[PDB]
Amino acid sequence: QIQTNYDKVVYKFDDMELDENLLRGVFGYGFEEPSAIQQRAIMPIIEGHDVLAQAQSGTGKTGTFSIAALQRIDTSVKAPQALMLAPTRELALQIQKVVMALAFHMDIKVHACIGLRDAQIVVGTPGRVFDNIQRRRFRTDKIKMFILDEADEMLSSGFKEQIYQIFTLLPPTTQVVLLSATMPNDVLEVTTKFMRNPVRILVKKDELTLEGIKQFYVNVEEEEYKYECLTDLYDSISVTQAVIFCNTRRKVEELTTKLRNDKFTVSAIYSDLPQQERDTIMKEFRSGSSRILISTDLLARGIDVQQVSLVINYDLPANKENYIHRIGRKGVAINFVTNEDVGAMRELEKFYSTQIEELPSDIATL
Amino acid sequence: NRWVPKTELLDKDEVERKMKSLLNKLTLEMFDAISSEILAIANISVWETNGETLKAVIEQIFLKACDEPHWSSMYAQLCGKVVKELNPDITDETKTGPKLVLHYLVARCHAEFDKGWTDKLPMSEEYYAAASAKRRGLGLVRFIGFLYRLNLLTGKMMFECFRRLMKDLTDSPSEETLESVVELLNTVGEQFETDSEGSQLLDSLFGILDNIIQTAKISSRIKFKLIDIKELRHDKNWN
Numbered sequence: 001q002i003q004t005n006y007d008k009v010v011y012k013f014d015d016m017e018l019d020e021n022l023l024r025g026v027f028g029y030g031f032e033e034p035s036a037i038q039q040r041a042i043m044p045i046i047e048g049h050d051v052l053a054q055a056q057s058g059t060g061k062t063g064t065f066s067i068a069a070l071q072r073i074d075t076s077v078k079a080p081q082a083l084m085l086a087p088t089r090e091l092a093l094q095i096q097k098v099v100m101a102l103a104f105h106m107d108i109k110v111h112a113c114i115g116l117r118d119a120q121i122v123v124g125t126p127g128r129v130f131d132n133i134q135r136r137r138f139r140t141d142k143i144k145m146f147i148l149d150e151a152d153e154m155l156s157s158g159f160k161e162q163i164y165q166i167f168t169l170l171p172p173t174t175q176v177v178l179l180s181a182t183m184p185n186d187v188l189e190v191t192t193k194f195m196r197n198p199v200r201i202l203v204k205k206d207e208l209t210l211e212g213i214k215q216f217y218v219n220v221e222e223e224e225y226k227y228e229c230l231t232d233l234y235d236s237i238s239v240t241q242a243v244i245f246c247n248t249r250r251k252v253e254e255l256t257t258k259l260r261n262d263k264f265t266v267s268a269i270y271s272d273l274p275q276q277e278r279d280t281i282m283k284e285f286r287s288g289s290s291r292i293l294i295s296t297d298l299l300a301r302g303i304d305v306q307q308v309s310l311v312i313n314y315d316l317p318a319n320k321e322n323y324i325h326r327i328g329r330k331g332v333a334i335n336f337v338t339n340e341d342v343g344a345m346r347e348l349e350k351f352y353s354t355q356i357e358e359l360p361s362d363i364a365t366l
Numbered sequence: 367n368r369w370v371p372k373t374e375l376l377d378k379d380e381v382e383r384k385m386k387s388l389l390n391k392l393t394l395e396m397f398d399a400i401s402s403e404i405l406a407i408a409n410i411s412v413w414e415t416n417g418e419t420l421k422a423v424i425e426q427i428f429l430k431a432c433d434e435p436h437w438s439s440m441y442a443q444l445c446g447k448v449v450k451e452l453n454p455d456i457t458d459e460t461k462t463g464p465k466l467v468l469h470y471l472v473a474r475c476h477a478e479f480d481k482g483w484t485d486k487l488p489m490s491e492e493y494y495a496a497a498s499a500k501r502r503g504l505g506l507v508r509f510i511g512f513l514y515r516l517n518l519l520t521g522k523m524m525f526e527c528f529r530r531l532m533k534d535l536t537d538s539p540s541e542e543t544l545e546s547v548v549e550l551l552n553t554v555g556e557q558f559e560t561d562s563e564g565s566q567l568l569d570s571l572f573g574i575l576d577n578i579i580q581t582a583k584i585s586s587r588i589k590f591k592l593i594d595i596k597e598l599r600h601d602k603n604w605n
């Protein structure tokens with residue numbers, strides 16, 4: 001855990017003196033307002049400082065350094081001017097997709113390293129990028145910016161020496177940006193040694209609350225009655241999309257196919273799926289392909305509670321701890337409680353010191 | 367007061383419930399299956415005299431479309447399915463088959479349109495009700511644009527639409543309104559070019575936007591949108 005030492009936030013992209021071609025890129029990609037890190041770290045990177053960012057994934061990390069870098073690029077110079085490093089080719093392919101997308105309206109070649117003596121931004125993994133420098137396959141004398149994404153993962157996947165080497169093969173005035181979710185001794189070593197008086201930024205994930213959402217319950221009395229209550233719910237209130245949580249993978253899947261028979265369009269996620277598979281399911285759902293997402297709990301943690309108005313706890317959380325992860329921040333949470341669930345729902349009652357009124361006949365309004 | 371679970375005719379309630387359920391299930395994947403079921407509910411009107419159930423179905427599709435803009439165009443397709451596949455035997459004492467539904471669509475935009483809304487807004491008390499008023503109004507102009515594009519509405523309602531938007535465009539326009547105009551012009555601008563008059567209305571409208579760009583203080587993002595329809599209509603000619 002590192003401490004912040006830079007006190008300058010910029011709230012709007014308009015206030016970042018970006019180039020039009022780049023600004024068009026950022027907007028036409030989906031970004032409208034900078035996230036936390038982006039508010040704090042785009043401008044220091046552009047101004048020349050070494051930036052040390054401790055930030056979790058899904059905070060806007062890739063967009064922070066991709067924007068700063070494009071802005072800094074000199075389209076006149078047709079050589080590598082920035083090197084972006086990542087632990088995996090998957091991750092470096094992502095970063096490339098993004099860098100390219102923000103760059104749509106500028107003349108900047110981006111090459112991936114897993115015909116690169118003329119790329120202006122280079123992206124790859126530490127081994128392949130080392131080998132390629134050594135084989136004199138890519139010009140490093142124009143490199144002005146070295147971005148190490150997920151330094152912790154890179155050091156923990158056996159990339160220490162490759163990185164140390166790379167540091168010493170780039171112009172000794174290369175600016176360094178290092179981003180890491182964790183800051184263990186190993187990563188601080190890279191920092192003390194290879195960085196100069198870095199701007200240190202720490203973005204801590206925002207704690208979830210229940211205040212935002214209005215929670216209700218429905219006494220289905222018995223388990224055999226849960227489904228029938230769900231279908232009637234959809235006769236009663238108007239839904240854009242919903243998330244439904246069950247405890248087991250079996251019920252997720254049984255419920256999924258029961259709903260499809262009734263002509264619902266539904267997406268299911270549970271633990272055994274590849275992290276890539278879940279990622280696609282969530283993305284396609286958040287884009288409107290399906291209108292219901294059913295999920296287990298083990299991954300109520302990696303899940304993204306977007307503007308989804310409605311959340312239904314079809315099963316009640318066996319572990320008290322995961323009720324916040326299912327329905328935490330405005331929206332609506334509706335729990336299914338059977339006769340045996342009542343004492344369990346008293347636990348949630350007092351664990352959060354929160355109130356969960358019974359579902360009113362007047363809801364189609366609320 | 368607690369919510370409680372539980373050759374064919376349906377009372378108001380039974381027709382609002384099946385319709386909520388059918389409109390909540392409407393996706394691209396399940397479309398033909400579910401636009402077929404919504405059409406059987408519409409078709410109930412063969413056994414009626416004043417088309418009351420079909421009027422009721424149209425009215426609900428509009429309410430849905432206006433609150434779920436992201437799907438306005440799929441709902442707009444649902445309507446095209448009802449117009450095309452409605453039972454022709456159907457009569458309303460107050461025009462039959464398709465020409466009946468077409469008239470229903472118009473009558474219902476006029477109704478929903480006339481209610482109106484304000485562009486300038488004051489979390490607050492009645493403040494939620496008026497953010498929803500604008501949101502829903504703008505969701506409707508959007509929905510109009512998707513009906514017009516499938517030729518389920520005439521230009522007269524598209525004039526009234528641009529007419530309303532131009533009004534808010536001259537009195538310090540909010541960013542949601544400007545957003546709305548661009549999206550409408552992108553959806554329907556080319557087609558509207560020729561409709562009676564119509565090129566001449568766009569002339570006025572684009573002059574209000576050139577002004578807005580060249581004077582008003584708006585986010586770069588919106589300024590980029592305006593400069594892009596202006597070039598699209600004027601320089602690129604929609605091609």
Ligand SMILES: Nc1ncnc2c1ncn2[C@@H]1O[C@H](COP(=O)(O)O)[C@@H](O)[C@H]1O
Binds near residue numbers: 031033035
């Ligand atoms: N300014 C922004 N506005 C909205 N979403 C963003 C922004 N920057 C990044 N994201 C999203 O954040 C997610 C993960 O970002 P990252 O932390 O870069 O891995 C991506 O899915 C992006 O779409």
